Design a binder for this molecule. Structure first.
Ligand SMILES: [Mg+2]
Length: 480
């Protein structure tokens, strides 16, 4: 711990004299709170140099399809192979070797909600929040594993939920008020994501939010790795004997939590890291793509921008009807705990694996002239973010896997408030109900009046066990 003077001197030496412009006019308590905040910034001099340089760089690659040996598709695999992977996955779950890391983010502000995003109700007939839907998915897969192994008690899948600092209390309160949706209170473990200072447009100065406080912001989903180390989560995976991790984002209302087929794929192929993708059908779709970087022969994720319209439109040589680069990233990963133990210390210590991504933003803060707070109408600074997928190139190519899945069954994200064309509570609700209805019709059920039904996870995790609906008629809104 450093004293008031040592803290002040370290920021002044790092050319941040503007942070103390009003320091002497503050009360002693205001000063002490400010020093405490500044003390939380790890190696500030190093941070500032990295940012300014990163901003300069932000103002000719060779990409191709991943090698066939590293890919697979649930749309192509035989039912027997899918069942074998499911069994490998249920076996791991049944032996307590599987845990889930959830990136829950912050408030559902963009959706028009002040509550944590996981609390959002897309208005299914059941009115269940995203958190409850995912909690029931976990309970059901624990049940399917128990049945497969014929165990006396159901196995436990620990669910580690990373919240932003501001939503930690409301998130934990929501779970407690609902008695953990039926899960054991000990298997839901909360931990907060870290933050980084916000900077001016050039990236050479940290911004003051108030006369005695700097602007800070969540450090991107790539901040997960450092949060796992610092909050003792990696320690806990080891103490609990966990071997396999399924990681995803709370906003996917269709997510197959702890999917045994995905875990089994990784076990069968002995992968250190794997990812799920869905087919990109329109060369115009705005989504990240998983590709092979031919220059370093490593797997990686590229944004729509980094590809030429030509390559984006290029068709596959072995099937002109499909796009050449069609592996759309749905932020759904597998990691082996052995790989995490080995790589986390490396990843969090260098820009090589987790480079800062820069975002120009309108940041409410002190006006650089008068020193009074204000809400800008044009970008006046930048926010930093690390991306979860930037660690992909560090994996050995033959230890990386990419599983293509069916979008209609596995991915429908909640991103925009109702009114937009895509990714709204309405599209999520309709995709969820259409998936449920499809499952029912596939099993011989019939839905009257052009309606839709909802399938409860306690009845079916992903379409199995619905043989009993054969010949039965359902009404719009029925829950099965
Ligand atoms: Mg393949």
């Amino acid at each position: 711990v450093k004293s008031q003077q040592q803290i002040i001197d370290s920021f002044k030496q790092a050319n941040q004299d503007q942070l103390f412009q009003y320091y002497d006019s503050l009360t002693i308590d205001q000063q002490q709170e400010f020093i405490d905040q500044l003390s939380t910034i790890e190696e500030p001099a190093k941070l500032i140099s990295t940012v300014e340089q990163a901003i300069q760089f932000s103002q000719s690659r060779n990409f191709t399809q991943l090698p066939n040996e590293q890919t697979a598709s649930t749309l192509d695999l035989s039912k027997d192979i899918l069942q074998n992977w499911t069994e490998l996955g249920l076996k791991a779950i049944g032996n307590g070797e599987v845990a889930v890391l959830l990136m829950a983010g912050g408030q559902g502000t963009r959706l028009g909600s002040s509550a944590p995003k996981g609390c959002f109700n897309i208005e299914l007939p059941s009115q269940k929040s995203l958190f409850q839907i995912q909690a029931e998915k976990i309970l059901k897969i624990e049940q399917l594993a128990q049945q497969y192994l014929k165990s006396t008690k159901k196995p436990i899948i620990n669910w580690y939920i990373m919240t932003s600092g501001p939503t930690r209390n409301a998130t934990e309160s929501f779970f407690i008020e609902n008695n953990y949706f039926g899960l054991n209170s000990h298997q839901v473990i909360f931990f907060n994501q870290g933050t980084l200072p916000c900077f001016n447009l050039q990236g050479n100065k940290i911004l003051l939010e108030l006369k005695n406080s700097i602007c800070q912001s969540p450090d991107g989903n790539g901040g997960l790795y450092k949060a796992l180390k610092d909050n003792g989560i990696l320690d806990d995976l080891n103490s609990k004997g966990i071997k396999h991790i399924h990681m995803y984002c709370v906003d996917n209302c269709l997510v197959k939590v702890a999917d045994p087929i995905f875990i089994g794929f990784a076990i069968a192929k002995k992968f250190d890291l794997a990812t799920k993708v869905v087919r990109k059908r329109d060369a115009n779709e705005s989504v990240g793509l998983i590709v092979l970087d031919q220059d370093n022969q490593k797997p990686c994720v590229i944004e729509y921008s980094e590809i030429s319209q030509e390559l984006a439109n290029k068709k596959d040589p072995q099937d002109s009807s499909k796009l050449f680069l069609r592996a759309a990233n749905i932020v759904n990963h597998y990691y082996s705990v052995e790989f995490l133990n080995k790589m986390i210390p490396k990843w969090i210590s260098s820009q090589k694996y987790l480079p800062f991504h820069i975002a120009k933003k309108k940041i409410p803060s002190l006006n650089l002239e008068n020193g009074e707070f204000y809400k800008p109408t044009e970008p006046n600074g930048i926010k930093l973010e690390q991306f979860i997928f930037d660690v992909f190139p560090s994996v050995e190519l033959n230890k990386f896997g990419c599983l293509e899945v069916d979008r209609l069954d596995e991915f429908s994200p909640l991103k925009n408030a109702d009114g937009a064309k895509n990714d709204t509570p309405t599209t999520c609700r309709n995709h969820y109900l259409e998936r449920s209805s499809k499952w029912v019709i596939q099993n011989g059920g019939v839905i009257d009046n052009q309606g839709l039904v909802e399938v409860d996870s306690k009845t079916s995790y992903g379409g199995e066990g619905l043989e009993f609906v054969n010949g039965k008629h359902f009404k719009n809104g029925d829950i099965i």
